[PDB]
Design a protein around this ligand. Structure first.
Ligand SMILES: OC[C@H]1O[C@H](O[C@H]2[C@H](O)[C@@H](O)[C@@H](O)O[C@@H]2CO)[C@H](O)[C@@H](O)[C@@H]1O
Ligand SMILES: [Zn+2]
Ligand SMILES: [Zn+2]
Length: 413
């Protein structure tokens, strides 16, 4: 890692051009060059190069992957004084706490929403159950009802979770990684409904991000499912669209996994103080987030002063409504094994390579095998085993401390 400059990694679907404009303001004020890059599969590349001290000074990703990076020692602990912490919403700071330590700067809150074409669909459906008949009526006009990414489980999880699927069982402020809900009856029903859409030719198993975005932004399909970053290309497309709450399934809301875009500092960076200055005094400002947001919308931003400007945007309102009904992703190291298992299950069930019950029993098994953790209470003289994490601080707790100790209450720790 090169001394005296900053290298930044951020996903290709984010506003990397706007962040680069923030880096040029930084360079004009300090003389420090800032290089922004968007490598492919950066969330799998970063743990690989950082383990030997390579990679960027700063990495951006949703918060769910940062706990695994921190567990492996790849992320520096950040030290914002309390005056700066008061500038961001408390909700966002919780997402970046791992093992009781803050391990990243929260940037923005993201959640999936239903996006619809107002000209084709003045009244968007409230339920998943209405989409088949709605697709039948729109094909009689040369359009389709719904196209969204079927290749990434992030997009299909809201439906799978709607009727009772879960990653890890959350109970009184705590997760239990021994209790996985990927092959239960509520997850089977949601995936079975999705596979039925493809079987009855209302959707194609092959549909990915680029195909769905192209079909919606050209006026071919009435609805898509996507996050705030996708609004930039819709806005320049000529489509007259709205953003709204995801439809219900079996009378229960779709529950999107909520992400907090977060900026982590590489443990091996010799430019940590320059990185903190960049993130605190240039990015996490009204002007800094505005430049990023004007490139690709971030969603609801963590900095209160600027979110108060964005809040009147109806698309932000819908994003927040969906976030309320969904749930914050855990940042525990087991999250990436969960995502890998669900990705395979969904793709194989949608393609007909496996039945729904085959695919999800495999996902449950493969994930559980991947899921040796010890309780964080320092008064344990010997390492005390557990499979429970506190959600607020992402600390392991044994069954004894989880029940007997008053600390780590569901409300506050
Ligand atoms: O599909 C699993 C995937 O979901 C999430 O990734 C999101 C990301 O949070 C969004 O910012 C956007 O880039 O879309 C991604 C899905 O393609 C998790 O954050 C990620 O770890 C996980 O692999
Ligand atoms: Zn304990
Ligand atoms: Zn706690």
């Amino acid at each position: 890692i090169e001394e005296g400059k900053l290298v930044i990694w951020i996903n290709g679907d984010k506003g990397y051009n706007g962040l680069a404009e923030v880096g040029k303001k930084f360079e004009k004020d300090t003389g420090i060059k800032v290089t922004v890059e968007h490598p492919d599969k950066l969330e799998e590349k970063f743990p690989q190069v950082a383990a030997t001290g390579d990679g960027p000074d700063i990495i951006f990703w949703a918060h769910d992957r940062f706990g695994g990076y921190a567990q492996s020692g790849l992320l520096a602990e950040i030290t914002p004084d309390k005056a700066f912490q008061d500038k961001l919403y408390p909700f966002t700071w919780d997402a970046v706490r791992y093992n009781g330590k803050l391990i990243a700067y929260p940037i923005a809150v993201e959640a999936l929403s239903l996006i619809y074409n107002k000209d084709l669909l003045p009244n968007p459906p409230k339920t998943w159950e209405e989409i088949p008949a709605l697709d039948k009526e729109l094909k009689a006009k040369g359009k389709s009802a719904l196209m969204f990414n079927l290749q990434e489980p992030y997009f299909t999880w809201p439906l799978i979770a709607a009727d009772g699927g879960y990653a890890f069982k959350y109970e009184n402020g705590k997760y239990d990684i021994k209790d996985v809900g990927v092959d239960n009856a509520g997850a089977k029903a949601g995936l079975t409904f999705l596979v039925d859409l493809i079987k009855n030719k209302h959707m194609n198993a092959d549909t990915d991000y680029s195909i769905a975005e192209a079909a919606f932004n050209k006026g071919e399909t009435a609805m898509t499912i996507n996050g705030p970053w996708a609004w930039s290309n819709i806005d320049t497309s000529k489509v007259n669209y709205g953003v709204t709450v995801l439809p219900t399934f079996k009378g229960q809301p779709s529950k999107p996994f909520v992400g907090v875009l977060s900026a982590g500092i590489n443990a091996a960076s010799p430019n940590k103080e320059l990185a903190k200055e960049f993130l605190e005094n240039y990015l996490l400002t009204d002007e800094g987030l505005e430049a990023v947001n004007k490139d690709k919308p971030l969603g609801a931003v963590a900095l209160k002063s600027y979110e108060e400007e964005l809040a009147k945007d109806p698309r932000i309102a819908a994003t927040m409504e969906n976030a309320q009904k969904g749930e914050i992703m855990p940042n525990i190291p087991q999250m990436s094994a969960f995502w890998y298992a669900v990705r395979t299950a969904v793709i194989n069930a949608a393609s007909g390579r496996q039945t729904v019950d085959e695919a999800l029993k495999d996902a449950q098994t493969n994930a559980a095998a991947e899921f040796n953790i010890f309780c964080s209470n320092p008064n344990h003289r010997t390492p005390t085993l557990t499979s429970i994490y506190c959600r607020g601080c992402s600390k392991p707790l044994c069954c004894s401390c989880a029940l007997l100790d008053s600390s780590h209450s569901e409300l506050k720790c």
